[PDB]
Amino acid sequence: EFIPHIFYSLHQIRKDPNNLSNQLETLTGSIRHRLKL
């Protein structure tokens, strides 16, 4: 399953941009992983 994970990661992006760049980069990498699969 990639659809709910994409949704959720999308929402903690749009909820907390104030996270340090580390979390943003890691989470974007996670979304790139899910759409790659």
Partner: peptide, 27 residues
């Protein structure tokens, strides 16, 4: 060879395509 032509004919293929493009722009 006609398989990919049939796949490109249905809209949701284009949908996944520009969804990938939009995430590429976002990243």
């Amino acid at each position: 060879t006609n398989s990919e032509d049939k796949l490109s004919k249905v809209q949701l293929y284009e949908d996944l395509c520009r969804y990938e493009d939009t995430l590429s722009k976002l990243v």
